[PDB]
Amino acid sequence: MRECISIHVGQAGVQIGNACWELYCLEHGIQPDGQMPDSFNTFFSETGAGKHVPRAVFVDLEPTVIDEVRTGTYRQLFHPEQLITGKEDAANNYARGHYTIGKEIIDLVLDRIRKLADQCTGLQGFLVFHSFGGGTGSGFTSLLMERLSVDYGKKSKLEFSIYPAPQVSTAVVEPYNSILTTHTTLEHSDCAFMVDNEAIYDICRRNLDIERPTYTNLNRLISQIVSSITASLRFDGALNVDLTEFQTNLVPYPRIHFPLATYAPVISAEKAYHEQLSVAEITNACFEPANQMVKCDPRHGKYMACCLLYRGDVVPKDVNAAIATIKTKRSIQFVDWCPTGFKVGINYQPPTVVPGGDLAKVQRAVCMLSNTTAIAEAWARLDHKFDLMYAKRAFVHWYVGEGMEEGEFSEAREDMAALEKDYEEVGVDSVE
Amino acid sequence: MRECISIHVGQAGVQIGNACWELYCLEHGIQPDGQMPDSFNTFFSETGAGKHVPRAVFVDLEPTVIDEVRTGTYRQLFHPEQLITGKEDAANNYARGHYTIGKEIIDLVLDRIRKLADQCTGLQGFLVFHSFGGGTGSGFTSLLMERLSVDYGKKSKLEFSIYPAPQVSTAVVEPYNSILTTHTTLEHSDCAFMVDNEAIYDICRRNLDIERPTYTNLNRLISQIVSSITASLRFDGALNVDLTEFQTNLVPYPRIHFPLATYAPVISAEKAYHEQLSVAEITNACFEPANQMVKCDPRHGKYMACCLLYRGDVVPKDVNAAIATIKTKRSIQFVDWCPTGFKVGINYQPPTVVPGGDLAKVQRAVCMLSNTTAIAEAWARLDHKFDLMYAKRAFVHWYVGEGMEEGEFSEAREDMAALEKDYEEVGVDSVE
Amino acid sequence: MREIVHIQAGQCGNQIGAKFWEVISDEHGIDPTGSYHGDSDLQLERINVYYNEAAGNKYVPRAILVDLEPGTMDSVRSGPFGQIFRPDNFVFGQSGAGNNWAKGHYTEGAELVDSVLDVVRKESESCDCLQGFQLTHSLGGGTGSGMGTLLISKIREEYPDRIMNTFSVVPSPKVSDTVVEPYNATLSVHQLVENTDETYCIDNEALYDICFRTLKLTTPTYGDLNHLVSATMSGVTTCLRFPGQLNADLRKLAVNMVPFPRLHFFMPGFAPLTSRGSQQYRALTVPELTQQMFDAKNMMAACDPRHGRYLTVAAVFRGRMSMKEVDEQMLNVQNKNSSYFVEWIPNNVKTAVCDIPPRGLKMSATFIGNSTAIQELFKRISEQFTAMFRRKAFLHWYTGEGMDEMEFTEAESNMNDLVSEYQQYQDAT
Amino acid sequence: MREIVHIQAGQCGNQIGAKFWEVISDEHGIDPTGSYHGDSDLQLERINVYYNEAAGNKYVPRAILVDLEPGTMDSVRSGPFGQIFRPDNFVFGQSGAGNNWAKGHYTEGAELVDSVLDVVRKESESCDCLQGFQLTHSLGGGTGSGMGTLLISKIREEYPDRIMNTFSVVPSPKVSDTVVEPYNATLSVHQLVENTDETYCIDNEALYDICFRTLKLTTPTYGDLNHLVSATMSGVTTCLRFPGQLNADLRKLAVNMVPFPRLHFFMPGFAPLTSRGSQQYRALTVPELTQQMFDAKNMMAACDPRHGRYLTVAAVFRGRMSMKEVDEQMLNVQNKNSSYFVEWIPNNVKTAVCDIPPRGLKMSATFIGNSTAIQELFKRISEQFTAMFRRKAFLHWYTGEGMDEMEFTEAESNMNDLVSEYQQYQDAT
Numbered sequence A, B: 001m002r003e004c005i006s007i008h009v010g011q012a013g014v015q016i017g018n019a020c021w022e023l024y025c026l027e028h029g030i031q032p033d034g035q036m037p038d039s040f041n042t043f044f045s046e047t048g049a050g051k052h053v054p055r056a057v058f059v060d061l062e063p064t065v066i067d068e069v070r071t072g073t074y075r076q077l078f079h080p081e082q083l084i085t086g087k088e089d090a091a092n093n094y095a096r097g098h099y100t101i102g103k104e105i106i107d108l109v110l111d112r113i114r115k116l117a118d119q120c121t122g123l124q125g126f127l128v129f130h131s132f133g134g135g136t137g138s139g140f141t142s143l144l145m146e147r148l149s150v151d152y153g154k155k156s157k158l159e160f161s162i163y164p165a166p167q168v169s170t171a172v173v174e175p176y177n178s179i180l181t182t183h184t185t186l187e188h189s190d191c192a193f194m195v196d197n198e199a200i201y202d203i204c205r206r207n208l209d210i211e212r213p214t215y216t217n218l219n220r221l222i223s224q225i226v227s228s229i230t231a232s233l234r235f236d237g238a239l240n241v242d243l244t245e246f247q248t249n250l251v252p253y254p255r256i257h258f259p260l261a262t263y264a265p266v267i268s269a270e271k272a273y274h275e276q277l278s279v280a281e282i283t284n285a286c287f288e289p290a291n292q293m294v295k296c297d298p299r300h301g302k303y304m305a306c307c308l309l310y311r312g313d314v315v316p317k318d319v320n321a322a323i324a325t326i327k328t329k330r331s332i333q334f335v336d337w338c339p340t341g342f343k344v345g346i347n348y349q350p351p352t353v354v355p356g357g358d359l360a361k362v363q364r365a366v367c368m369l370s371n372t373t374a375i376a377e378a379w380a381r382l383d384h385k386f387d388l389m390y391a392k393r394a395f396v397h398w399y400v401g402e403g404m405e406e407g408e409f410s411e412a413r414e415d416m417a418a419l420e421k422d423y424e425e426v427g428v429d430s431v432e
Numbered sequence C, D: 001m002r003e004i005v006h007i008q009a010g011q012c013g014n015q016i017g018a019k020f021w022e023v024i025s026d027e028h029g030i031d032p033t034g035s036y037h038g039d040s041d042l043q044l045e046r047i048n049v050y051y052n053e054a055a056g057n058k059y060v061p062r063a064i065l066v067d068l069e070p071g072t073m074d075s076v077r078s079g080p081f082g083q084i085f086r087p088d089n090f091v092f093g094q095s096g097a098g099n100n101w102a103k104g105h106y107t108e109g110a111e112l113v114d115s116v117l118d119v120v121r122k123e124s125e126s127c128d129c130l131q132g133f134q135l136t137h138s139l140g141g142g143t144g145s146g147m148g149t150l151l152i153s154k155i156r157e158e159y160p161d162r163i164m165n166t167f168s169v170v171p172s173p174k175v176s177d178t179v180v181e182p183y184n185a186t187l188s189v190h191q192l193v194e195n196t197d198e199t200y201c202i203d204n205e206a207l208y209d210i211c212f213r214t215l216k217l218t219t220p221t222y223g224d225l226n227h228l229v230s231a232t233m234s235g236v237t238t239c240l241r242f243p244g245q246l247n248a249d250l251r252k253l254a255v256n257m258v259p260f261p262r263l264h265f266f267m268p269g270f271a272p273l274t275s276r277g278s279q280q281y282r283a284l285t286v287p288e289l290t291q292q293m294f295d296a297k298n299m300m301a302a303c304d305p306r307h308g309r310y311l312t313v314a315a316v317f318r319g320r321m322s323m324k325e326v327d328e329q330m331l332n333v334q335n336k337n338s339s340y341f342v343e344w345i346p347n348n349v350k351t352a353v354c355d356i357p358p359r360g361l362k363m364s365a366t367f368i369g370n371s372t373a374i375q376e377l378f379k380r381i382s383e384q385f386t387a388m389f390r391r392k393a394f395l396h397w398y399t400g401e402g403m404d405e406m407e408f409t410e411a412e413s414n415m416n417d418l419v420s421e422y423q424q425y426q427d428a429t
């Protein structure tokens, strides 16, 4: 009755969503043919017969990865009027994603979302999966977030955005696309979550002992974070949480709405023994800087607010013991004006294991959603990458030639610099 | 006991009627040999033995398509004194259909209709199937509608006319034939329905995913509209409708009697899954402009009156919910003087599927008969096509030479222009 | 003694009666064959009011069924309890109304009424001491408006002393079935105000609320909606068919509810109504019945009683109960809602107590209200009538059957005079 | 006579009541079907205070359940003792509070309260002589703060003579569930001080001590924590449902505990509490109950009573005992702790003795304290409120729902005036 549709934009959105909807079927016993041999009513609309379909809209400008879902194993699961393709890709270009190509099929996708919005009565919010580096995931997403705030407005629009890595970048124009897509979504988004690739390569090597990871293995660990946040809508819990409750507890000021995700425990199959993994044991792994999924030192910043999502066999008393020790440590420090910096959620269901995966079966897990000022050092490095390339006016003729005024870069850069000094306003303490 | 004969004029009438009477046999279990291994008493007159024959009169001026029914599969079904042929076709010419050829065999067809009228006691009305572009379907029909209003008068004479397409025209003289046949039938017809070819090519491509349709596949979807209107005479329903009731509820002024048809749902076989198709879901597909079977924007006009024909497993309470949401939308807008713009009909029988067809088996369907002022933009384009060709007096010597005064065009054109400003009288609102 | 002749008109009036005669038959134990298979001896004590005893100890209903096409008449005689009616009473035509008041009252109604009145008079002679007539029809339809009001104009010319009441179906505010129903209702109210002793206004839209908000039925059909209308109708004449501590009938209610001869439009209400499984969580006493008869969500007419003022209230109770506990509740609703009534009528509540409950239940009640809150029903129609008549749309289907435009102006003048009367006594004191 | 209407709000208030009505049912022998299967005849002697007798000798609770989403309401009706509640009383919304006081009290609370007050008034008419209302909610949540205090503002306008008390849950010092709970508590205390006769402050953090230090439970859940709160609630009205040597009720405790109309915040305590196997190593007499009601580790509010001074003390005893042995212990704790009380109130201990113990036990007691040691509870909140309001953080979720910054200043002014009063009478003499 509390439904929540999800939107997957670009190639990065679909390949994450392949592992996500694979995981949702196993957490309810859903066959790949839509059958099963209403807790799941939030993410599945039942047909007249015994068949359930996802509430997802897969959109991409290039026809490669969408046809793989149309031809792969999960073929009879999706509604074929939802798998929206395009003629040509945006090709790492915000201007082709926002002016040239995106203005052709934006009215088709909004028609598909509005038909899903009508049959749902308790529609909470939207879940947009994209990446800052890609042409579609930054261009078409910035067009899409404009229309939803115009039409709906009062719905909790969330983003599990892929933040660009500090040292491992594939596309050369990633400093251009991240500045342009942030200036557009800043007035439309509610709470956008950051997940970096390079830190997950660090976790899968050090913890899982996998020296050869692929994008499949990255999409498994990301889908665990997607599962634990939406776990409260799908199962009964001793202390639940709603998607409306994230944007209230994690966003202090209307500009700063960029938290980061952290999942624990992440251990291998043979390392599932030799340790007990209590709730006081796995909570300290979250605030360890080695397990944070954004390559930033948290001791260079201050934590504003932190969400904790427990699931499995979790005792509510020992959570109170575990949080109390973290407030007594000295490396972890909060901001002066915020005395209460915790949002606690407990669910009963343990996280399941996908067969043919790499994580071991545990009885408890923690998803941490922390909003800290330590990301402000990373935004300044992104502005330093942007100011070098734009000073020589490199790659600009691929942007002006696709319907864009050249003076628009001064709009986005100065707004980012004004966003940069806002963390400096937060970073100072109170008076007396 | 409430019988209703049907008349099929020209090549467009017969090829529609081939798919229509194919559909009536399957909705009663009638063999193609007339046998069956009295709800069907309206459309079939029983013989002395166990054999039923249709109440249809197939008339055409060329002997090609009539002999196909005489030699095809449905051969032992029809009375061979009903399949009326002619020597030569009218050959896209109103004058040959109304003066030269039609005056030879008009007394034979009226003899066949009057013999069918005598054995029926509750004769409601007539159903004429033709096309505006053809020589027979516009010439011979205009002669035929004169005699029936003289003889019968008090009978509900209906027309499922084929409106000429805005961009896809085969015959060059279609702007001539449509103006002449409208000026004649305006004082004789009761409620003529419009169905366009080009919009059905748009529906069969977008919805059914058939990129190669033929005239057979167009005749299947048209026959579903013929079936759902005559469904109340053939089956018991919770809220029935009569053919006398259409001309009362849909025609506000005695000149404007041109509604348009809309059928929903139209989906493929594999798309019959993945969705539930409620009565609130398929009703919004009717008022969608993409599914309207006349290439006209409905938001350019205003709806005067609308008939809704439900069939199948239809709950009467949820119909009241579905209509109430449509009156709350803002793109759909009615006329100021009409507060009540709905005629609701519910039948119990679901629409069946012809074997070897293309539509899937559903449990419910909607036939919408809407009379709007949005067609007035299409009549003005037809007058613009007429005034260009007539100003150079092109093709006129094929009309004057077949027994017609040349000044007769000024009679039909000025009456159409006077019909054009009548919608402008309807389009303005009330006073205070 | 005190027999009732039942007349059914239109498509809706026939399908109500096909449900209605099934309801009365379970109050008397009547099989679909037509014999008697009851158990209590009070069932055959007053059987003659709705039935005529035939040879072989079978009972046939005193019903007259009118239509203009053999469609719905074929459905009734082939359905359940279709083999109970006399086949002579099925009067029908071949043309069909076409959902029009003109062809229902002028053209085909005039050629049918003599075939009907030869059957009405045949039932009128057979009754010992005739009480009066009742009619079930529509107001938005073509048959039940035209043919229905024509029969009332012929009956009152013959039987002025007999009571004549109609369980009419009034059109709804939000949705609309008939497009031309502001014309059909206005030309029918003009006939009903001069020829009917009392009139029960029933909206389908108010019935969709009770089937969803109260009874929690996900999928109600017309077999479930028309079931509630028939339950109200049996609760009116339940004090004529059974003895009680304080008996009433159709004539007592026609006097205590009508202060002025033009103000005889009602609103019906029935109690108790619960869900299927949610009956065990509630006691069934007299104050449980009283609190359900007076809230706005129980009226079968789409009108809020809190706007206007009541004039008179008829409460008809069924089953064994106590008179003080009635008067504990009938007085209390006149004290706390002291502004919602009218002032110059003291003790405007009429009490009627029958002894026999319906089959299975323990006790029941029936609400017959009369308020100035039905002026919103006429102001909504009269606004829709003037918004359509001023453009003269849909008028050639009336002018083409011999009807001048003065006839529309007389009905519109008659309706506004009725609105001014309910407007007067609302603000009066 | 003297009936109680029970109102539940928020997520926590519903899960307390789902445990609470299971506790009361074992004091009256009520199956999950809803019938009576007790053994002692004193159970049905005063059954009408928390139950309404239905048809078929079933009893339904007089409970009203409020939420803004159908999540937790679906959990209660599907769990054990979910089939005992009347399905009409489940009032809920579709939006959800989102853990915010503004949308709980202004936006969605205003569109829900009329649906609630039509149910509250229905329970208010059915009671013979209504005693008063009780409420179970939170102060850190969004629903139980906003929707909870809104219902109190509507009730006191209608029923000023009825008692209104809340078993509220107060936020904890060390850990914090809601991030914006200094805003949610401060805007709710501003409503509670003007509309509640008495208020029971309960901390979850004080309950985690007793489940670990006293009962030695390694793994306590909320089903075990909320079990202790419900045991305190039954021990308050235990002298209204059973005869005793000296009887009390909700009105006597509302007079003897409230010297000034703003000082009506309490601290609850329950005794005896031992381990499972460690009960055989201890006698169960009256001085064993007295020594456990007064130490700091038994209070259900995270505050040390040794700092401030008590004003009044209510001791409610259960089971057969002797009055001298009560007064041997009730006087002795006023002699040795002679500085910890207040001086200008002589004999500030109220005695209440019931006859019936809980099911299985031999005797029991219930502590209702009232001290100036709860000023630390407000000084801790008011310091956290000013530390967040001065930077105006998390404020656009309140300004975006129509709330001026004067409204925050009035609540902060009202709380500091309450702190100054408890600061005054602590050092007074």
Ligand SMILES: CC(=O)O[C@H]1C(=O)[C@@]2(C)[C@H]([C@H](OC(=O)c3ccccc3)[C@]3(O)C[C@H](OC(=O)[C@H](O)[C@@H](NC(=O)c4ccccc4)c4ccccc4)C(C)=C1C3(C)C)[C@]1(OC(C)=O)CO[C@@H]1C[C@@H]2O
Pocket: C022, C023, C026, C027, C215, C224, C225, C227, C228, C230, C231, C234, C235, C272, C273, C274, C275, C276, C279, C358, C359, C360, C361
């Ligand atoms: C154990 C018991 O009492 O069961 C009832 C029952 O519980 C309820 C749910 C019944 C039931 O009614 C419905 O469920 C219903 C649904 C849609 C539309 C109308 C009714 C019942 O059908 C109604 C039916 O009532 C009767 O039989 C009355 O005598 C009724 N006659 C009929 O409904 C009837 C009609 C045709 C064929 C057979 C019976 C009646 C009412 C007024 C005046 C005269 C007769 C019975 C026994 C029950 C059920 C089966 C559940 C209720 O209705 C009536 C009319 O009594 C719904 O509100 C009441 C509350 C009742 O408690």
Ligand SMILES: CC(=O)O[C@H]1C(=O)[C@@]2(C)[C@H]([C@H](OC(=O)c3ccccc3)[C@]3(O)C[C@H](OC(=O)[C@H](O)[C@@H](NC(=O)c4ccccc4)c4ccccc4)C(C)=C1C3(C)C)[C@]1(OC(C)=O)CO[C@@H]1C[C@@H]2O
Pocket: D022, D023, D026, D027, D215, D224, D225, D227, D228, D230, D231, D234, D235, D272, D273, D274, D275, D276, D279, D358, D359, D360, D361
């Ligand atoms: C042989 C015997 O007497 O065993 C007791 C028992 O020994 C002890 C350990 C009980 C027991 O309680 C617990 O173990 C407990 C654990 C976590 C949280 C709360 C309680 C008992 O459950 C408590 C329970 O008490 C009752 O039944 C009371 O009537 C109680 N009702 C319930 O607890 C109850 C709730 C739901 C379903 C069934 C029972 C009550 C108390 C106050 C007001 C009204 C009712 C019983 C018989 C016992 C056990 C089983 C061990 C104690 O609790 C109570 C509430 O009496 C814990 O401190 C006391 C000391 C008791 O001696």
Ligand SMILES: Nc1nc2c(ncn2[C@@H]2O[C@H](COP(=O)(O)OP(=O)(O)OP(=O)(O)O)[C@@H](O)[C@H]2O)c(=O)[nH]1
Pocket: A009, A010, A011, A012, A013, A015, A016, A060, A061, A062, A089, A090, A091, A092, A093, A131, A132, A133, A134, A135, A136, A137, A138, A162, A164, A170, A197, A215, A216, A218, A219
């Ligand atoms: N987390 C994650 N990121 C991915 C994955 N595949 C690609 N990416 C990231 O996506 C970015 C590349 O952009 P794409 O999303 O593929 O491009 P697009 O937005 O779909 O559209 P075009 O650029 O026009 O092709 C880089 O930052 C990649 O690291 C994946 O499986 N997981």
Ligand SMILES: Nc1nc2c(ncn2[C@@H]2O[C@H](COP(=O)(O)OP(=O)(O)OP(=O)(O)O)[C@@H](O)[C@H]2O)c(=O)[nH]1
Pocket: B009, B010, B011, B012, B013, B015, B016, B060, B061, B062, B089, B090, B091, B092, B093, B131, B133, B134, B135, B136, B137, B138, B162, B164, B170, B197, B215, B216, B218, B219
């Ligand atoms: N809907 C539909 N229209 C058809 C079909 N076949 C032909 N038409 C249309 O009919 C028109 C041509 O008219 P015809 O019926 O062939 O001509 P006619 O009236 O018989 O007269 P002649 O040309 O003299 O034989 C064109 O507009 C065609 O598009 C068909 O199967 N379905």
Ligand SMILES: Nc1nc2c(ncn2[C@@H]2O[C@H](COP(=O)(O)OP(=O)(O)O)[C@@H](O)[C@H]2O)c(=O)[nH]1
Pocket: B238, B239, C009, C010, C011, C012, C013, C015, C016, C097, C098, C099, C100, C138, C140, C141, C142, C143, C144, C145, C169, C171, C177, C178, C204, C222, C225, C226
């Ligand atoms: N309650 C109810 N209303 C009905 C039913 N059938 C038709 N109606 C109503 O009757 C009106 C149409 O009248 P109808 O009897 O069909 O037309 P007529 O027979 O030509 O007079 C509309 O207001 C319909 O909603 C039915 O079974 N029950």
Ligand SMILES: Nc1nc2c(ncn2[C@@H]2O[C@H](COP(=O)(O)OP(=O)(O)O)[C@@H](O)[C@H]2O)c(=O)[nH]1
Pocket: A238, A239, D010, D011, D012, D013, D015, D016, D097, D098, D099, D100, D138, D140, D141, D142, D143, D144, D145, D169, D170, D171, D177, D178, D204, D222, D225, D226
């Ligand atoms: N004792 C107790 N406290 C609870 C429980 N559930 C939530 N809480 C507390 O209630 C507060 C959260 O309020 P909540 O009811 O969930 O929010 P709301 O429903 O939006 O008003 C926090 O202080 C929680 O510690 C419970 O079952 N027991």
Ligand SMILES: [Mg+2]
Pocket: A010, A011, A062, A089, A134, A135, A136
């Ligand atoms: Mg791409």
Ligand SMILES: [Mg+2]
Pocket: B010, B011, B012, B089, B134, B135, B136
């Ligand atoms: Mg041809």
